[PDB]
Every structure is written in structure tokens, then in C-alpha cells.
Amino acid sequence: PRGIIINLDEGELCLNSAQCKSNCCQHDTILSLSRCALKARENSECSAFTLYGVYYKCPCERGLTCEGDKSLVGSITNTNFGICHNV
Amino acid sequence: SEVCFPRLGCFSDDAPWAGIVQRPLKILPWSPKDVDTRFLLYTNQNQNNYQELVADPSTITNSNFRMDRKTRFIIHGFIDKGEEDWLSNICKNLFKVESVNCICVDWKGGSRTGYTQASQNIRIVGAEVAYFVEVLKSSLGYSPSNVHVIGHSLGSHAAGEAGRRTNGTIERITGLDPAEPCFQGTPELVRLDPSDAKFVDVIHTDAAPIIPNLGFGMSQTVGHLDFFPNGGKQMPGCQKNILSQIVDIDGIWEGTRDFVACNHLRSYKYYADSILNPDGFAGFPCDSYNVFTANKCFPCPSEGCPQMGHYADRFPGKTNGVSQVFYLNTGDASNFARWRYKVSVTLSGKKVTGHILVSLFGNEGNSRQYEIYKGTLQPDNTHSDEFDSDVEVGDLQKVKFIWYNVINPTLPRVGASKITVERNDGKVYDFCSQETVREEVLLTLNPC
Amino acid sequence: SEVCFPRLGCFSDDAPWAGIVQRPLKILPWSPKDVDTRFLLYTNQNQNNYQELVADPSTITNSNFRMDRKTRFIIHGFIDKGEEDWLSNICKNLFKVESVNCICVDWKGGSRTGYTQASQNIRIVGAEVAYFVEVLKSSLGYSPSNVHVIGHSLGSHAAGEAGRRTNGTIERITGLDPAEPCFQGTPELVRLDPSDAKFVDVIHTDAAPIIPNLGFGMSQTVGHLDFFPNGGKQMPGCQKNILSQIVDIDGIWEGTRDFVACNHLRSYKYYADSILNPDGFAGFPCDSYNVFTANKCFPCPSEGCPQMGHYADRFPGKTNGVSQVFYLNTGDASNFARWRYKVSVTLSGKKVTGHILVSLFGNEGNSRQYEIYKGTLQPDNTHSDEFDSDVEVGDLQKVKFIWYNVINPTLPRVGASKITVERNDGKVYDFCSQETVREEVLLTLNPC
Numbered sequence: 001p002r003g004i005i006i007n008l009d010e011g012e013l014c015l016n017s018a019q020c021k022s023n024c025c026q027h028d029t030i031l032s033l034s035r036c037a038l039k040a041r042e043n044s045e046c047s048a049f050t051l052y053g054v055y056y057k058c059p060c061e062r063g064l065t066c067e068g069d070k071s072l073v074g075s076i077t078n079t080n081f082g083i084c085h086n087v
Numbered sequence: 088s089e090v091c092f093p094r095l096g097c098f099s100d101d102a103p104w105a106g107i108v109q110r111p112l113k114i115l116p117w118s119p120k121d122v123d124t125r126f127l128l129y130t131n132q133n134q135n136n137y138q139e140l141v142a143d144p145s146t147i148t149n150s151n152f153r154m155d156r157k158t159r160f161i162i163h164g165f166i167d168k169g170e171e172d173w174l175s176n177i178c179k180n181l182f183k184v185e186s187v188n189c190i191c192v193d194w195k196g197g198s199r200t201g202y203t204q205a206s207q208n209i210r211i212v213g214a215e216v217a218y219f220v221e222v223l224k225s226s227l228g229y230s231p232s233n234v235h236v237i238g239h240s241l242g243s244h245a246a247g248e249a250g251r252r253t254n255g256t257i258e259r260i261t262g263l264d265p266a267e268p269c270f271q272g273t274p275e276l277v278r279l280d281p282s283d284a285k286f287v288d289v290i291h292t293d294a295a296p297i298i299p300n301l302g303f304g305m306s307q308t309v310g311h312l313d314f315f316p317n318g319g320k321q322m323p324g325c326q327k328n329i330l331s332q333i334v335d336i337d338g339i340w341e342g343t344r345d346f347v348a349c350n351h352l353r354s355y356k357y358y359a360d361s362i363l364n365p366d367g368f369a370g371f372p373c374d375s376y377n378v379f380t381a382n383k384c385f386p387c388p389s390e391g392c393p394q395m396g397h398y399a400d401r402f403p404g405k406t407n408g409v410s411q412v413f414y415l416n417t418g419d420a421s422n423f424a425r426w427r428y429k430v431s432v433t434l435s436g437k438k439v440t441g442h443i444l445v446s447l448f449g450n451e452g453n454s455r456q457y458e459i460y461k462g463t464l465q466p467d468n469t470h471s472d473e474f475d476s477d478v479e480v481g482d483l484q485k486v487k488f489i490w491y492n493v494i495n496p497t498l499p500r501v502g503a504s505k506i507t508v509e510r511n512d513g514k515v516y517d518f519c520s521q522e523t524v525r526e527e528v529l530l531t532l533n534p535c
Numbered sequence: 536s537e538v539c540f541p542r543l544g545c546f547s548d549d550a551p552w553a554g555i556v557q558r559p560l561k562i563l564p565w566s567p568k569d570v571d572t573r574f575l576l577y578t579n580q581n582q583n584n585y586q587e588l589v590a591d592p593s594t595i596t597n598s599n600f601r602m603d604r605k606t607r608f609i610i611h612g613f614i615d616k617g618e619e620d621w622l623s624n625i626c627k628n629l630f631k632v633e634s635v636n637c638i639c640v641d642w643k644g645g646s647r648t649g650y651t652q653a654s655q656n657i658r659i660v661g662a663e664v665a666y667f668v669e670v671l672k673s674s675l676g677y678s679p680s681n682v683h684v685i686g687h688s689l690g691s692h693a694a695g696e697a698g699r700r701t702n703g704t705i706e707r708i709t710g711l712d713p714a715e716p717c718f719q720g721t722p723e724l725v726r727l728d729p730s731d732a733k734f735v736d737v738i739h740t741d742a743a744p745i746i747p748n749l750g751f752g753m754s755q756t757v758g759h760l761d762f763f764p765n766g767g768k769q770m771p772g773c774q775k776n777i778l779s780q781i782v783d784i785d786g787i788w789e790g791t792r793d794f795v796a797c798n799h800l801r802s803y804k805y806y807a808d809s810i811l812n813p814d815g816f817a818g819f820p821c822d823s824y825n826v827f828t829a830n831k832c833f834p835c836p837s838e839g840c841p842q843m844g845h846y847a848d849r850f851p852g853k854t855n856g857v858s859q860v861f862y863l864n865t866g867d868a869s870n871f872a873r874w875r876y877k878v879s880v881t882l883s884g885k886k887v888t889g890h891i892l893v894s895l896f897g898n899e900g901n902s903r904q905y906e907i908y909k910g911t912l913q914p915d916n917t918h919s920d921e922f923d924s925d926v927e928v929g930d931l932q933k934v935k936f937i938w939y940n941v942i943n944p945t946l947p948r949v950g951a952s953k954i955t956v957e958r959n960d961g962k963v964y965d966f967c968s969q970e971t972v973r974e975e976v977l978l979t980l981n982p983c
């Protein structure tokens with residue numbers, strides 16, 4: 001979904017997390033469309049930093065650490081999914 | 088002028104039906120054949136595909152209609168038809184929570200004409216829905232008690248017709264953002280108003296004025312309880328760019344409807360969710376909305392907060408007046424349930440500039456990180472705010488604190504001696520630590 | 536146009552204050568010097584001769600005013616002044632029942648001008664009374680709770696001003712027959728209406744229309760409870776010949792006032808008595824007045840009857856709606872308290888033509904002889920009626936029966952096997968005899 005403008009609200013359209021205010025441009029599958037979403041919270045699913053710039057599950061709010069898969073398969077298939085956790 | 092039609096009696100174009108100044112033009116209702124009021128039945132026994140009733144007792148006695156249940160009518164409004172998914176949602180959600188007769192009310196024939204026209208036919212739509220209650224009551228036995236009629240825009244008024252003609256004996260009428268133009272003003276005998284049923288609870292999601300900011304909603308009170316979620320005038324989730332509003336996640340019909348009358352339409356949105364979140368819509372008496380956002384009137388009064396939407400009917404202080412207004416904040420998307428908590432933090436460490444930020448943990452679950460203050464952080468100042476958590480944490484066990492956006496190489500440290508959280512319940516929970524932490528670090532406080 | 540005056544702020548002659556069609560002419564309020572609103576204090580410590588307050592806290596703190604009591608304002612209306620005995624009666628009666636601050640409100644300067652004019656100054660009179668509550672509240676501490684404002688004709692509206700400006704926080708506003716012309720119609724923001732106080736109970740004693748039967752009273756509802764004693768339009772005791780109305784037993788001022796606006800004035804009459812008879816004014820929900828006289832809706836509903844007048848404030852189903860109308864019947868003179876009882880008699884003896892007639896006896900006292908039926912009396916027919924006894928008998932012990940106006944030399948005899956009396960309470964008392972009696976003879980029945 002085209003976006004092409006900066007500092008987007010949640011629910012707005014995004015090609016990439018750099019545009020979102022949240023700095024998470026999420027979308028539920030590979031074929032769905034990327035809309036800004038909110039950083040996951042403690043204890044909710046997350047992904048570690050993707051280069052693809054677009055998430056199936058967001059990065060966590062500050063102070064938290066996404067604790068789950070950080071494998072190779074994951075990094076290419078954009079599925080390094082972890083739960084957020086304190087330290 | 089006057090027309091009279093078979094079942095529905097006569098229809099004068101006399102004041103205050105027209106001529107009066109907020110309703111100038113003299114125009115009549117249409118034949119009860121053009122309106123073409125239809126009654127689309129849905130039950131637990133038959134979500135997904137509707138039955139169809141006319142007032143004919145045999146029809147409703149040979150149908151999935153059940154008079155050992157309870158009945159809810161859903162009347163659309165202008166430019167809409169009783170099939171449109173929003174009317175079915177409300178039946179679906181209702182079926183999750185409840186066993187019920189969920190009659191959607193189509194009058195798409197009547198509704199697609201001119202605005203003034205459409206606002207005129209509603210007397211017929213009112214009179215149809217009114218007549219149906221009649222035959223239920225007298226022919227079938229089904230007391231106008233058990234009826235609850237919900238209507239949106241023009242439809243709320245229709246429900247006011249049905250309510251009026253029924254000598255105000257229907258249990259409840261719900262006004263999902265009543266239509267302002269030629270109804271706001273206009274005597275009790277044109278608009279919805281608390282007289283039209285035993286309890287009339289209105290949700291105002293697009294008040295503030297047709298001129299010049301284009302609101303189709305009613306400033307005016309009406310009904311007993313009068314909720315103005317998000318302050319009534321500007322629903323959050325409706326200022327999106329054109330592209331994002333139209334291509335919205337429920338398909339490109341919904342986004343166009345929200346492109347056209349977003350704020351206006353949110354009324355049945357909020358109603359729909361509240362069916363499923365019985366506690367997510369608590370409303371707050373206040374002398375204003377600004378005074379509410381100015382954090383000057385929390386938690387809920389000793390009697391309770393009304394729940395906005397499906398559960399306003401269980402408020403105790405309910406019929407006990409007229410035009411009681413209440414404020415709550417709602418989500419921006421399609422779970423809209425929020426839960427207001429007040430949190431005050433007292434700071435340790437030393438003078439730093441930045442934001443504080445707290446997150447609640449409780450036996451139910453835990454919350455996002457809501458800001459609380461931002462500025463010169465510095466020790467011993469107590470700071471406060473209340474925020475609309477999108478998680479109901481329940482009974483608190485802990486909280487955490489976190490701050491950001493001023494560190495020299497110094498690596499300053501800031502902390503919280505005590506944070507007390509007050510639920511809308513009224514409870515205050517106390518949380519203490521003598522720790523400090525450096526920025527972007529999560530200090531948990533425990534109950535002192 | 537607009538004027539602004541020292542204490543009372545500004546005064547627009549803009550719609551809906553004028554220009555609007557039930558209130559066409561554009562006219563302003565008078566200087567707050569011409570109205571000359573005065574506040575005549577009366578207390579238990581000083582009936583008979585009044586103190587005088589202006590909003591000046593020292594004045595009211597150096598007066599017999601007492602803020603550990605409760606305050607009632609009495610605003611006259613058109614062509615009247617706050618001295619006129621009716622205002623003092625209400626303070627006197629009040630003092631019998633109650634310890635109270637009974638402020639009569641004179642605005643005789645404002646009231647003696649033109650009608651349209653006077654209806655205009657009331658905003659000032661409203662604004663004065665409103666300001667007074669203000670200083671009480673803020674300067675003195677005296678909560679607008681403890682205020683009850685009663686007003687007659689134009690005055691009721693004045694109270695609506697005071698109520699409005701006070702953000703509807705005064706405990707009660709009472710409308711002794713509000714003035715119709717240029718107020719019936721006119722938005723909430725001109726007339727009395729339930730918004731102007733926490734409880735607005737109206738007594739309609741001269742509704743039904745200025746054209747062409749000359750009623751100065753309001754058909755319109757207004758307020759929460761809406762009593763129409765004697766059906767609202769034609770107060771009994773007001774159809775006397777000219778001579779008897781003018782030379783009435785309270786002097787020849789009162790009879791002229793009653794000669795001028797009898798029905799209209801009865802409103803404060805009924806209010807005055809109801810202070811002293813706490814139970815003598817019970818009112819009855821009904822679909823009409825005709826249906827009430829048609830004896831189709833007695834006794835009192837399970838919640839209660841509102842007492843019309845001074846005690847409407849103790850109804851439970853009180854604020855629990857808006858425009859609840861009630862019917863009672865009242866006397867024709869100056870104790871107006873009545874007590875409705877329903878009596879059904881079943882006849883013995885044999886076919887005779889004539890009237891039956893029953894009289895109640897109870898631990899409190901006994902009643903006149905009220906008719907019950909009249910026509911072909913004949914045995915085994917049960918006949919009924921309800922009547923407005925001018926004595927509250929209390930708990931019945933016996934009744935008696937008597938009949939008249941057909942005897943041949945035959946000396947027929949007629950009697951009553953059973954009479955059951957139902958109080959407005961709901962109780963039914965049963966009374967039986969197998970006796971007959973001949974005409975003009977008192978058969979007592981006893982409780983079976």
C-alpha cells in the first residue's frame with residue numbers, strides 16, 4: 001500500500017516503518033497491506049529488527065527485549081518472532 | 088395537507104411537522120409502499136440468513152421469532168438499507184452475549200430520496216415499527232416492555248415515532264447519533280426525546296454544527312443518559328488521509344462510508360463493541376469535555392458510571408433524570424473499549440529532562456506504556472495523569488517505570504519512590520521503590 | 536439589540552428571546568431599577584412583618600435569614616406584587632408545617648407594564664433571584680440545593696430564569712399555572728422546563744386555550760410531574776354568578792381577582808392548602824381526564840400517587856421521567872383537599888327507581904353521603920362509582936346505605952348485600968348485610 005509521506009498515525013498506510021510515528025509498519029501476511037501499528041507491549045509477541053522494514057509482529061516498546069527466534073531461516077523469511085520481556 | 092393510509096392512519100403536513108422554522112417546507116410522508124418498510128428477522132437459531140416478517144401474527148407465529156425471548160429493532164437511516172453489514176454485526180455480537188430477536192428494519196425505499204423527504208418518511212417507518220409492536224402486544228401478547236429499538240441518524244427519530252405512537256411503553260430506545268437537521272429544535276413530537284420510551288440513551292458521535300464543519304449529529308441532548316465519547320465532535324480514527332480512510336481494513340465499502348460520514352457512523356461502531364466489552368465504556372460526569380481531558384473528574388461517582396452503548400440500561404441512576412451527560416474516551420479502531428486509570432508518580436534520582444512512562448500489571452494482564460508527564464524531571468515532584476489503557480489489567484500487582492531522552496555521557500538516573508494507580512473503581516493502589524534506573528530501563532515498583 | 540446592567544450581565548433581544556414566532560416583537564428587559572426586584576423575608580421568627588434583603592451577604596448575615604434552614608422563594612407574576620396576601624399565606628402555612636426562610640419576591644415595578652413587556656422583564660426578575668442564590672452559595676456557603684423557588688404565571692418562568700442561570704442546581708421549581716402566551720412554544724431557553732432545576736413540578740389550573748375561552752394557563756407540559764387538578768381547564772368554584780364571585784368570603788379584593796383570573800389563581804390556592812393536608816391531593820395517572828372521571832383508573836399505582844402541591848417532591852417516581860401527567864379532583868373552596876374512594880354496592884329488596892347513596896365510617900371519622908348510582912334500582916345488580924370524599928375516614932369500620940325518590944304507598948324496600956370500599960391505598964374493605972330498608976332510611980352494613 002502506497003504511503004510516501006512521513007510521520008503517519010496508526011491505521012494509516014505505509015510501505016515501511018520509517019514512515020510510521022510508532023516506527024512499526026505492520027501487516028498480518030505477506031499479501032496484506034502495511035498499515036502503521038503500535039509497538040508490542042510486555043508479554044506480547046514481537047519481532048526483532050527486520051531489514052525488510054515491515055513487520056508481521058512489531059518491535060517492543062522501549063525497555064523491552066524481544067525474546068524468541070533469531071535464526072537464519074527467520075531473518076530471511078522475516079519471522080524472527082519473540083515475546084517482549086524485561087532485560 | 089393530510090394523507091391517510093390503510094394500517095398507519097393519517098399524516099398531516101401541519102406544524103410542528105412542517106412550517107415550523109427548523110423544518111420550513113411543507114411535505115408529506117410517502118405511500119407506505121415506497122418507504123417499503125421491511126422487517127428482517129435474525130435469531131440465534133438463524134444468524135447469517137434472515138427471515139422476514141410483516142405485522143401478520145401468523146407470519147410471526149410461524150417464524151423463528153420467539154416471544155419467550157426479547158426483541159431488538161435496528162433502524163438504519165438516510166441513504167442506507169436494513170441489510171448493510173452494521174445492522175447484522177449488532178445482531179451477531181448480540182447473539183454472542185445474548186439470546187434475542189434481532190429485527191433489522193429496512194426502509195431503503197423510503198431512505199434514498201431527498202434528505203427533507205427522507206426525514207419526512209420516518210413517520211411512516213416509525214408508524215410501521217410502531218404497528219408491529221402493537222400486533223405483538225395485542226394479537227400475540229408480546230409486551231412492548233420486551234422491545235428495545237436502536238436507530239441511527241434519521242432512524243433514531245423513527246424509533247421516536249414508534250416510541251411515541253406506543254404511548255412510550257417500549258423498554259428502551261437508543262439513539263446512535265440522531266440526525267440534527269430538521270429534528271434538533273422541533274418539539275418532543277418530532278424528535279427522539281425521553282418521552283418516547285421508558286429509557287432513552289443517546290450516543291453522540293458527531294455533534295457540533297452542520298455549519299461550517301459538516302456535522303450530521305445532534306448537539307442537543309435527548310434521552311435520559313447522553314454519552315459524548317471523545318467529547319462528541321471529533322471521533323478519533325477519522326482524520327486519516329483519504330487513501331487510508333477509503334482502503335480501510337474492513338474493505339473499501341466501509342472506508343468510503345467512513346470517508347463520507349466517519350464520525351457520524353462511529354456511533355454504531357461503539358455500540359457494536361460494547362456488546363462484548365461490558366465494562367470497556369464507562370462514562371464520566373463532568374462540567375465539560377475539556378474539563379475531563381483536563382483530568383479534573385475521575386474515578387466514577389459512587390453510584391457508578393454508565394456504560395456507553397449496550398449496557399447503559401443497567402446504570403442505577405438511569406431514569407432518575409433527563410439529559411445527564413457523560414464523557415468517556417474510546418479507541419480509534421475496531422475494538423474501541425478503553426479503561427481509564429489515573430497514575431501519579433513521585434520522582435527520585437536527580438534533575439534531568441525527559442518523559443516518564445508507566446505500565447500497569449495486574450491479575451488479568453498488563454498494559455502498554457502510557458506517558459504520565461514530560462519535561463524537567465527532578466526528584467520529589469509528584470506528577471500525574473490519567474490515560475485510557477487499552478487493556479483492563481484488573482487488580483494491580485505491580486507497575487513499572489521508564490524514562491527517556493536526556494542522557495549526557497553522565498548517564499543520569501531517575502526513579503519513582505511511589506506510584507499510586509487509581510482504577511475508575513475508586514481504589515488506589517500504592518507502589519514504592521527506592522531504586523533509580525538510567526534511561527530506557529524498566530524499574531518495577533512493588534506494592535508498599 | 537443588547538443591554539447590560541451592573542450585577543445582571545447582558546440582555547439580547549435576539550431569538551429565541553424575540554423574533555421567534557410565538558414571541559414576535561423585539562423588546563428588551565427594563566433597567567434592574569424599574570422591575571425593582573425586592574426580596575421580602577419572612578421566617579418562623581417573623582411571620583406577619585417582613586425583613587428585606589438585597590444580595591449583600593452582610594444584609595443576609597445580619598437578618599433573620601438562617602442558613603441552617605431551607606429557603607423557598609415565591610415569585611408573583613403579571614399585574615401583581617410580592618406583598619399580595621397569597622404570597623404570605625404560603626409562608627404562613629409553611630411555618631405551621633415547617634421551619635423555613637420564606638422569601639417573597641416583589642417585582643411589582645416590573646410587573647405592571649404591558650404583558651409582552653412584563654414577560655420580558657422576568658429575565659431580570661429571574662436574573663435577580665438567580666444572583667441571590669449565587670451570593671448565598673459562594674459568599675455565604677448556602678447551597679443552591681436548599682433553595683426551592685415557586686412562581687405563578689410569569690413568575691414560574693422567572694424561576695426558570697433563576698434555574699437556568701444556576702445551571703439547574705436549585706432543588707425544586709414549582710409552577711403554579713405558568714403563563715401560556717409567549718412562553719408555550721419557545722425553547723427550553725425561554726420557558727420553565729425540567730432542565731431549570733433538579734425537580735420541576737407544575738400545577739396546571741388554567742390550561743386550554745387563550746382563544747377563545749380565555750385561559751392564561753399552559754396546556755404544554757413542563758417539569759417532571761404535571762398535575763391537572765379538575766382536569767386542568769375548568770376549576771370548580773369559578774363558575775359562580777358575578778355577585779357571588781366578587782363578594783367572596785375572603786373579602787372583595789379576592790373575589791375580584793377571582794372574578795378576573797379565577798381558574799388561573801387557583802394554582803396557589805391549591806398549593807397553599809396542600810401544605811397542611813399532606814395526603815389530601817394524591818394524583819392519578821390516566822390516559823386522559825375524561826377516562827379518569829369515567830372511573831377507569833383508581834386506586835394509586837403501586838409506587839404511589841404524587842401529592843399535588845407542596846409534597847410532589849416526595850414522590851418516588853419523581854425525576855424518573857419528564858412530563859408525567861396526573862389527575863386529581865379538588866374542592867371548590869378553601870379547603871380543597873379531597874380523598875378518592877371507590878364504592879360498589881350490590882342491591883337487595885326489589886325493583887324500584889331511585890338513587891343509592893353510601894357514607895363511610897372509619898377510625899378517623901365519617902363522610903358525607905355520596906351518591907353511587909341512580910336509576911332502576913333492582914336486586915342483585917352491583918353498581919359502582921368513586922367519589923372525592925371531603926373527609927378522610929381512615930381505616931373503615933362500617934358503612935351505611937340510603938336510597939330515595941320512588942315510593943308508592945307500597946313502601947318498597949331496597950338494601951345492600953355487600954358494599955366494598957377501595958381506598959386510593961388499594962385496600963378493599965368488605966361490608967355485608969341481608970337487611971333491606973325503605974326510602975330515606977340509613978341501613979348500616981358491617982364488615983363481613
Ligand SMILES: *[C@@H]1O[C@H](CO)[C@@H](O[C@@H]2O[C@H](CO)[C@@H](O[C@@H]3O[C@H](CO[C@H]4O[C@H](CO)[C@@H](O)[C@H](O)[C@@H]4O)[C@@H](O)[C@H](O[C@H]4O[C@H](CO)[C@@H](O)[C@H](O)[C@@H]4O)[C@@H]3O)[C@H](O)[C@H]2NC(C)=O)[C@H](O)[C@H]1NC(C)=O
Nearest residue numbers: 307308374375544545546668669672679699700701702704
Ligand atoms: C452556573 O453556571 C456555570 C456552570 O459552569 C458557572 O460557570 C459558567 O457559566 C456560564 C455563564 O457565566 C456557563 O454557560 C451556561 O449555558 C446555558 C446554555 O445552554 C448550554 O448548557 C450546557 C453547555 O452548552 C449544555 O450541556 C446544554 O446542552 C446547553 O448547550 C445558559 O444557562 C447560560 O447561557 C446564557 O447566560 C448569559 C448570562 O445569563 C446569557 O445572557 C447568555 O447570552 C446566554 O443566554 C449559561 O451561561 C459556562 O459554560 C460555565 N462554565 C463552565 C466551565 O462550565 C456559573 O458561575 C454557575 N453559577 C451557579 C449558581 O452555579
Ligand SMILES: *[C@H]1O[C@H](CO)[C@@H](O[C@@H]2O[C@H](CO)[C@@H](O[C@@H]3O[C@H](CO[C@H]4O[C@H](CO)[C@@H](O)[C@H](O)[C@@H]4O)[C@@H](O)[C@H](O[C@H]4O[C@H](CO)[C@@H](O)[C@H](O)[C@@H]4O)[C@@H]3O)[C@H](O)[C@H]2NC(C)=O)[C@H](O)[C@H]1NC(C)=O
Nearest residue numbers: 096097221224231251252253254256755756822823826860
Ligand atoms: C396507547 O394508549 C392507550 C393504552 O392505555 C390506547 O388507547 C388510548 O390511546 C390513545 C391513542 O391510541 C391515547 O391518546 C394519545 O394522545 C396523545 C396526545 O398528546 C397528549 O398526550 C397525552 C394525552 O392527551 C397528554 O398528557 C400530553 O401532554 C398531550 O396532550 C398522543 O401521544 C397521541 O396523539 C397524536 O399521536 C397519534 C398516534 O399515532 C397521531 O397520529 C395523532 O394525530 C396525534 O398527533 C395518542 O393518540 C389514549 O389516552 C389511550 N387511553 C387508554 C385508557 O387506553 C392506545 O391505542 C395504546 N397503544 C399502546 C401500545 O399503548
Ligand SMILES: CCCCCCCCOCCOCCOCCOCCO
Nearest residue numbers: 165166167240241266303343344347348
Ligand atoms: C461526498 C461525496 C459524493 C456524494 C456521496 C453520496 C452517497 C453516500 O452513500 C454511501 C454510503 O454513505 C453512508 C453514510 O450515510 C449517512 C449520511 O447521513 C447524512 C445525514 O445524516
Ligand SMILES: CCCCCCCCOCCOCCOCCOCCO
Nearest residue numbers: 611612613614615647687688792795796
Ligand atoms: C397599572 C394599573 C393596574 C392594572 C389593572 C389590572 C386588572 C386586573 O387585575 C386583577 C389583579 O391581578 C391578579 C391576576 O394576576 C394574573 C397574573 O399573575 C399574578 C401572580 O402573582
Ligand SMILES: [Ca+2]
Nearest residue numbers: 247275278279
Ligand atoms: Ca418524540
Ligand SMILES: [Ca+2]
Nearest residue numbers: 695723726727
Ligand atoms: Ca428553561
